[PDB]
């Protein structure tokens, strides 16, 4: 990761824990770390820390592999972006003055999503080019560029809780008939094709949201967080709850 | 016949100016 080398990146951790570590850090004015965005691929969190309270800017790395924040200039890394903020806040509450480093020993916390797409992309290397041993995992040194892309975008294809033809009826009936638990959900694509529905059960009635993608590739919820994938999607809102009556909890079959 | 998201409990993230 172009990031594991900075003592304030945290990798893959959740806003809460991210917290603690500010908090156990001193709150001072400008302190930060940095954390991976779980909503797009490559990016990351800017957690800062002004007035003792926080304060979270998304980094989403640009198309020519830069990285910004929302309507800030781009950097060639995350290293650059806070040497730059360091003297300029240019939009923070202020510079980043003390870099909020990971405790001894601690190292950055493994993403679930990168670690499930170091699992795909080496099966679909095995399953086409029937590779064993360290001759496949060469192969995938070099058959990694836009297959990593595709399988991250295509993730949720393979996923149970995905159902491939699917209309509102047919959803609704099998979704009362198991369980009935909170939270038991599951997503499948629409008519209008760069669209998709979020069918779940909580406490009496199955719920629907509609999910649409703008160009740029992002999908969201109307007036809702955008993602990058559909994967990251689900996965954001098991424990976030995020607008939903309830967070995602349990999937249906395949 | 879509529920609408609860406009209240969206996690908000922070912007520049
Ligand atoms: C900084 C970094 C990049 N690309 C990422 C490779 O490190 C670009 N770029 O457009 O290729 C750039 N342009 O101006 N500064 C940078």
């Not at chain 1, 509450?93 to 499930?116: A, I, M, T």
């Not at chain 1, 290397?125 to 001759?135: C, D, F, N, S, Y």
């Not at chain 1, 599951?186 to 649409?212: D, F, M, N």
Request: charged share 25%; glycine share 8%.
């Amino acid at each position: 990761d172009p990031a594991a080398h900075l003592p304030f990146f945290y990798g893959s951790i959740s806003r809460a824990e991210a917290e603690e570590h500010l908090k156990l850090a001193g709150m001072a004015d400008g302190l930060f770390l940095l954390r991976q965005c779980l909503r797009s691929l490559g990016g990351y969190v800017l957690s800062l820390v002004h007035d003792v309270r926080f304060h979270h800017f998304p980094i989403e790395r640009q198309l020519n592999g830069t990285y910004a924040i929302a309507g800030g200039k781009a950097h060639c890394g995350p290293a650059e972006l806070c040497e730059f903020y360091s003297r300029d806040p240019d939009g923070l509450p202020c510079n980043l003055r003390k870099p909020c480093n990971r405790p001894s020993g601690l190292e950055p916390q493994p993403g679930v999503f990168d670690s499930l797409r170091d699992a795909m992309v080496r099966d679909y290397v095995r399953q086409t080019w029937k590779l064993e041993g360290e001759a496949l995992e060469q192969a995938i040194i070099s058959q990694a560029p836009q297959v990593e892309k595709l399988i991250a975008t295509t993730a949720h294809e393979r996923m149970p809780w995905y159902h491939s033809s699917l209309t509102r009826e047919e959803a609704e009936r099998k979704l009362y008939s198991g369980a009935q638990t909170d939270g038991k959900f599951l997503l499948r694509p629409r008519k209008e094709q760069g669209t998709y529905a979020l069918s779940l059960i909580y406490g009496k009635t199955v719920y629907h949201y509609l999910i649409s993608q703008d160009k740029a590739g992002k999908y969201c919820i109307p007036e809702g967080t955008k993602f990058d994938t559909l994967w990251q999607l689900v996965e954001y809102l098991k424990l976030k709850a995020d607008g939903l009556i309830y967070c995602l909890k349990e999937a249906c079959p395949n | 016949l879509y529920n609408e998201l609860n406009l209240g409990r969206r996690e908000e993230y922070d912007v520049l100016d």
